């Protein structure tokens, strides 16, 4: 008969490549269009939120979470698939690093540990890997700014500008269309708004659009003063009221 | 300028080279038409 | 087919097991309404009236998790009672380890991630019931979190469950645009029950009696369900307006 | 024949060879071609990358070449999910030898034990075998430089020059004709770039898609030193060899 | 009769009107005229009703051979009918 | 850095007479400031002449002067920047001989040897060279190479929207006005969003082509809805704008009296456009043909003196135009 | 017809819209000529099996006065060799001879389906039927005095090639 | 597609139909995005079906708005609840 839809849990794919990954990438393609732009002085990520019912509160859905103050993340796919992954991903960064080195996890170690959970889901039978794709953007002292595309197959690669979701193929050219590596962060946000606007024309406001940036530390989000050594959070989530300010200036 | 063009691909590069000559109202295919024919047929066969 | 019996991904990305989860929620044909007031939250569930051989007091679609917190479930009964036992266990354990009340935002998140744990188990069947959590938060105030059997929860201005949910959402959407607020007036919690039932009858198009409905009320630091005499008292006050 | 059981590795095939090993060779050919070269004064490692995307940053990421220790640098070809599991396990086991014996592990000792790790999944348990193609490069004081390969069957074979991935038989034939018994380090670099140029669809042989690592014994005080050149230095050796 | 076809209409004339009328110009170029053209897109827009109007200007016989036609359980008539056309 | 900002203000205050001599004095800065890179300064000073209205003599005198100084060492690679602005001034000069002679030799060096997006900027000016030349073979070819490269290279809003305008102009002589006017209305939405970047004269001319395109298609309701309705008008009124309504009303009744009535009154903005006057004689023969078909419908062999009274023109004018047909 | 308008009662809102697109163009074609819209060819009446399929079929021919033509889809697709084109061609010939006629069908879900590429695998009688129904209305000779009616459960069981404009312009749901 | 580019389709079919002077043809090219010529043809025909429903032979502005409300469904999906995630 046809294939049994194996992750290589108990069975290797006879076709030479796993067929359900493309069906898991179909669940990735099922997700909203989410993009990111890696520049020299900062990294910006943009994504759209599903409206669903008109009475659903838009502030409840957060498609950009906080792992470490210097590293942001954005995802496209099923809702509960991202929560179970990150709830376990946080405990990995705490025990394997923060309970040992007692600092904030860098960009190289944190992204690698997130992909290891997907590797265990593919290896351990009976547990289906989650079909969400995560775009992790962060800034550390060692490697600096970084933008990585985490695939459900367990592979990650750096990208200057990349997109996931239904517009993964379409917006990838659109990001390369208006943006180049020589551009800075300020001109990158305007490009991210123009590219994400082409995804849906219904509502471009901050209610259904969640925009976040990575950049210079903000002392207002540090929560304390008096210590010059400890750096402030490099990730600042843009309020929906502030998102409309960038729309009028777009 | 091309890569691995078989007998079927060479005929199209020559056919497309004559296509620009019709827009030029010329009975001859200019050398500039070949430069646009290579960058076209190679990208034309790659699509789909 | 074998592809329809598996919990894992389908060829088209549409899970057949999840489609039966939402399909089983409409098997009982129960229409419930959950709205948010100003200082209070009132949720009313449709109470099916069986013959005289069943106790209507024992029959309930709303379970009490804790004070100020309440849950209404529409779907398969055997998965409805077991889902309430899991929400109560996590509510008491969270008030011990962390020593703080468990909000419906987290209370809908625990059952949502727990449903994904059931999908990872081959012998265990996931919950096919809808979990609607309502309470009055100390900060955010009234909040509604409705957990789909697939583990989807998001805040709502007004929500319902049933085949008429599309008609209920449309009727309540235009009403919220006139006042430009998602909260019901008459801050007194006694009058909030009047409007919550009034907007439900106009949305459903059918008037119900005291035995046809079960009115839950979640107040500040208190939660209770109106009995047959209290629901009948509400219908008398609603009839005069 | 007609009924073929692909499920468990414990199920024997009618021919006697597991069909999951056959199809694992196809997955290796789908990736980039990696050619290891064992020389007298060191080991030259060269490979090409499968990703052609310009938006991807190739200079900051290494898909194939990895470093197990100071004396061993390996290049993995296969599934990325299975690579990070086996490489990290190899790094743990290699340091465990340094824990007990306070010494660096020889190549033959590490390669032989890593081969049985893949076989352990096929020998017992319903888990998956990891189709992987490594490149085993290192030096010890016993047999000297040892260049081994990793087949999906979980074995190892001695190779002086070997090519894996796409164009396996095409690149290996070019190496056997120009092979030198001495295998000079400078000649090994020219031999690698000459073979990779014919097996790569790109005629210019861009530097950003290449991974170049070199082991040399001619360092200071006669010590083995592994240095992976930056892509800017990869473009420099392309002009010296006459590729560009 | 339908606007917005300037992208397609410009491509139709060269691949239809020229080889059926002006094809003598291709002999001055030295190449054979194109023997066909491929269409890619959802049917109903510049596909069904458009090709019937093109046969009017060319004054040529319009024959409908589809992908779901000549489909039957009998064997041997499939290749026989295509050769007769 | 201030001189770039000060250079824009000199034309505003009337210092452009002093500014034309200040630009060639910037050669000494290129040996120090910004480590050569003559594109940041000299090209910006000429760019200020396009945004702010400037005389034609001051623009050509500087463009043909500052290039001949020692800056040519950096202008070997940057010659594409000054060559585009030089051919632009030749358009207002109405002499394409100096521009066309350069373009023919420069097209060989401009393909992926210097600047990729600079092609359409050259093909756009090249299309205007053959347009005034009345050559439709090279004009449609130069635009085709620019429209084909639109997917490869990229151009700003002003350049992309101009490619559609130049496309619709090519459909003026080839008729087929059913699909022709779409290029004119599509570009106007791009120029309207330019706000400060768009001037009054740039958007006023675009409306003259959109109104003229609808008149060729001969729709009375669509022409009146543009000028009368303030939503479709966007507050644009001039002599050439109101003249299109009088011509549209003249075609409704088909009378040559009101056709030439607005000719003499609006002749300032009506006869200033060569494309409008080219279509003016097209309607002059169109409205006359409608009047000529009125005398031909009954039986012929009538008096010529009665023919001029029915049409409403002079005897010599009727005999001259009728014999031409 | 046979069944009167009493049994189809309750659909009057959809019945008046059905008469304007069927009864009006068959009697006075000048209605849509002044408007500028082309008359719809196919009209799909779908609902529960046996509910509203028989009542709405015989009611259209009774109110208009045209003859009642019932051509069930179960009489076309077979495992027997042949029986594909000859039924639709002769059905088109019968409606061509007698103008006041209206064709009705039943059980369209059995002859439908989109497969994947609209090819044929064991579809030999299925695909030849779906393509022939499209060539009759959009061909050189259509039925101006005869409207094609199909009866099924859900429109999802019909070939998307027949769902495009020019073939089926109307979908009426039977509650 | 584009707002002003689709006018060659919407406007061409509008020329073959009877319209009112108050009918707004710009509302069809704003909200609609990327429609095939077949789907667009059903929009103008639906406006005529709303005119005969009101017993009018001239399409008004309200008929163009009622025709769009039926055509809001283009791709095949269940209501607005599609794209489960």
CSV table of C-alpha atoms in Angstrom, one decimal, chain E residues 19-66:
chain,number,residue,atom,x,y,z
E,19,UNK,CA,2.1,31.6,-38.5
E,20,UNK,CA,-1.4,31.3,-40.1
E,21,UNK,CA,-1.1,34.5,-42.2
E,22,UNK,CA,2.3,36.2,-42.1
E,23,UNK,CA,4.3,32.9,-41.8
E,24,UNK,CA,6.2,34.0,-45.0
E,25,UNK,CA,8.0,36.4,-42.7
E,26,UNK,CA,9.4,33.4,-40.7
E,27,UNK,CA,11.0,32.1,-43.9
E,28,UNK,CA,12.9,35.4,-44.2
E,29,UNK,CA,14.1,34.8,-40.6
E,30,UNK,CA,15.1,31.2,-41.4
E,31,UNK,CA,13.0,29.4,-38.7
E,32,UNK,CA,9.9,27.3,-38.9
E,33,UNK,CA,6.7,28.8,-37.5
E,34,UNK,CA,5.6,27.7,-34.0
E,35,UNK,CA,3.3,24.7,-34.2
E,36,UNK,CA,1.5,25.4,-31.0
E,37,UNK,CA,1.2,27.4,-27.7
E,38,UNK,CA,0.6,26.4,-24.1
E,39,UNK,CA,-1.9,28.0,-21.7
E,40,UNK,CA,-1.5,28.1,-17.9
E,41,UNK,CA,-4.2,29.3,-15.6
E,42,UNK,CA,-7.8,28.9,-14.3
E,43,UNK,CA,-10.2,28.2,-17.2
E,44,UNK,CA,-12.8,30.8,-18.1
E,45,UNK,CA,-10.5,33.8,-18.4
E,46,UNK,CA,-9.0,34.2,-21.9
E,47,UNK,CA,-9.1,30.4,-22.5
E,48,UNK,CA,-12.5,28.9,-23.5
E,49,UNK,CA,-14.4,31.8,-25.2
E,50,UNK,CA,-11.2,33.5,-26.4
E,51,UNK,CA,-9.8,30.7,-28.6
E,52,UNK,CA,-13.2,30.5,-30.4
E,53,UNK,CA,-12.9,34.2,-31.3
E,54,UNK,CA,-9.3,33.8,-32.5
E,55,UNK,CA,-10.5,31.2,-35.1
E,56,UNK,CA,-12.8,33.9,-36.5
E,57,UNK,CA,-9.9,36.2,-37.5
E,58,UNK,CA,-7.9,33.3,-38.9
E,59,UNK,CA,-10.9,31.8,-40.7
E,60,UNK,CA,-9.7,28.3,-39.6
E,61,UNK,CA,-11.6,25.2,-38.5
E,62,UNK,CA,-12.0,25.1,-34.7
E,63,UNK,CA,-11.9,21.5,-33.4
E,64,UNK,CA,-12.4,20.7,-29.7
E,65,UNK,CA,-10.1,18.0,-28.4
E,66,UNK,CA,-10.1,17.9,-24.6
